[PDB]
Amino acid sequence: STGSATTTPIDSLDDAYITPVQIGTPAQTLNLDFDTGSSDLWVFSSETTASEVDGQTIYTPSKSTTAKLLSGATWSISYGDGSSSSGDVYTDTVSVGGLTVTGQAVESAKKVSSSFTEDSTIDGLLGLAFSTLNTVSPTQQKTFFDNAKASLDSPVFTADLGYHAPGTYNFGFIDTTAYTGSITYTAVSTKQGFWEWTSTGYAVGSGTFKSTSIDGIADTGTTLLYLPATVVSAYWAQVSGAKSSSSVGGYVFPCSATLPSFTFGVGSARIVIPGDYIDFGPISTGSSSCFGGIQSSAGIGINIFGDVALKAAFVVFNGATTPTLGFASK
User: Which of these is catalytic: 33, 35, 88, 307?
Assistant: First the structure.
């Protein structure tokens, strides 16, 4: 089997991407944030505290003839950005882009933190990291990909995120029309439960490439590119008037600037992030200070190749017995 779904930016900045997911019988379609940096599929629901729901579509398990309470199971998650959610668990039929899993754990939120409530466009998360990170207790549950894997034509999914445009998530096949040149594959460590890999270095604009190992994770659920402070300083030094602002919480730059590109290495290959991809717009409405898309990972404890980097590539998440990542230009 295969599946193929379109993923759409939630706003004009590509702050996140949502993908429609069918849950239950008859189908209830919710728009979920596909997150290769976590392993829970959780949804706003009929059980979510009413004051914490503001415009999201909810899953109502009592309206699904295939929903079953997973008795005794609870979940609770805290993300890198300080947001959180928790609740109880159902199993139900979940379909993505025509690919169906029966008996998927659907984690129903009883509580969500304010950042979830305030984002009316995201109805929940679909985690695509390794199932060792899943938070369901006392019986840990499998991701949608891990449940689908054995049925797929190939044990892979691909992320093809758009810049200010829709893109695609495919399951079980590699669309050879969706990228240019060849896919370069690179080793993955699953020791922290992430799609963790080592970039071979970077360049800023038309500058020389610096060969240096940068360990980090491929994370579709993180908006920005978080790298070591040395690398980030080297990038922003090429932008007149850019500075790190403790009050704003990262590097800002004059909205009048033209940003340089950023290149990262994948083995002997190179992925080029155009400068425009690194502009996240005014820090507040009407400001002439703009927020940068490349930020320091200092204090986060890991480097994160989030959407700013991934949207410059066609990315293969290879779930074979020994997982690997693939990157192609597009």
Answer: 35
**DSSP one-letter code for 151:** G
Please state, in angstroms and rounded to a whole number, the distance separating the CA atoms of residues 61 and 46. Answer: 8
Q: What Å distances lie between residue 286 and 43, 119, 211, 281, 283, CA to CA? A: 34, 21, 40, 10, 8
Among candidate residues 38, 45, 64, 199, the one labeled active-site is 199
Relative to beta strand 262-266, strand 196-204 is: antiparallel
Structure tokens at 39: 């392993």
Segment holding 231, helix H or strand E: helix 229-236
Instruction: Clarify whether 35 is annotated catalytic.
Output: yes
CA distance 79 to 51: 21
Q: Half-sphere exposure of residue 314, counting CA atoms within 13 Å on the CB side? A: 17
Is 1 considered catalytic here? no
Written as six digits, the tokens of 213 are 């190992």
List the domains of the chain with CATH numbers.
5-174 (2.40.70.10), 175-330 (2.40.70.10)
User: φ, ψ for residue 59 (rounded to 5)?
Assistant: -85, 125
Q: How was this structure determined?
A: X-ray
Amino acid at 262: F
Angle value at C-alpha 112, between 285 and 51, nearest 5 degrees? 80
146: its two tokens: 């891990």
Distance from C-alpha of 265 to C-alpha of 243, rounded to nearest angstrom: 25
Alpha-carbon gap, residue 123 to 237, rounded angstroms? 39
Residues in the chain, total: 330
The two structure tokens encoding residue 229: 């402070």
Burial class for 211, CB neighbours closer than 10 Å (0-12, 13-18, 19+):
exposed
SS3 state of residue 215: strand
| Beta strand pairing call for 167-171 and 324-328 | unpaired
